[PDB]
């Protein structure tokens, strides 16, 4: 099975930033599911620990401008 990463995000309080990241991340060869929230300012990224990595996720996310605190590995 895949692995869930939970990253707290700041500032992302609209559907645009979140959707944009959802698309961009969705594009990457190795992600399986993604759940970027805004309300509770937190981003779920669900990827396969082989194809892509935390750093790809964050580096690509942070690169947009949105700082993110990737620190939960609650896979199932």
Within positions 10 to 69, which residues make up the interface with Cu ion, using CB under 5 A? 14, 17
| Between 14 and 51, CB nearer to Cu ion | 14
CB 65 within 8 A of CB 30: no
* Cα-based angle 35, 37, 42 (whole degrees, multiple of 5): 100
- Shortest distance, position 35 Cβ to Cu ion, whole Å: 16
CB 26 within 8 A of CB 36: no
50 annotated binding-site participant: no
| Between 64 and 73, CB nearer to Cu ion | 64
Determine the 3-state secondary structure of 26 from DSSP. helix
Q: Which residue numbers belong to the known binding site for Cu(+)?
A: 14, 17
Summarize as ranges the residues that interact with Cu ion (CB under 5 A): 14, 17
């Amino acid at each position: 099975g895949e692995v869930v990463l939970k990253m707290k995000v700041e500032g992302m309080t609209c559907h645009s930033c979140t959707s944009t990241i959802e698309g961009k991340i969705g594009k990457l060869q190795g992600v399986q599911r993604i759940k970027v929230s805004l309300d509770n300012q937190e981003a779920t990224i669900v990827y396969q620990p082989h194809l892509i990595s935390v750093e790809e996720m964050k580096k690509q996310i942070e690169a947009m401008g949105f700082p993110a605190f990737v620190k939960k590995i609650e896979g199932r």
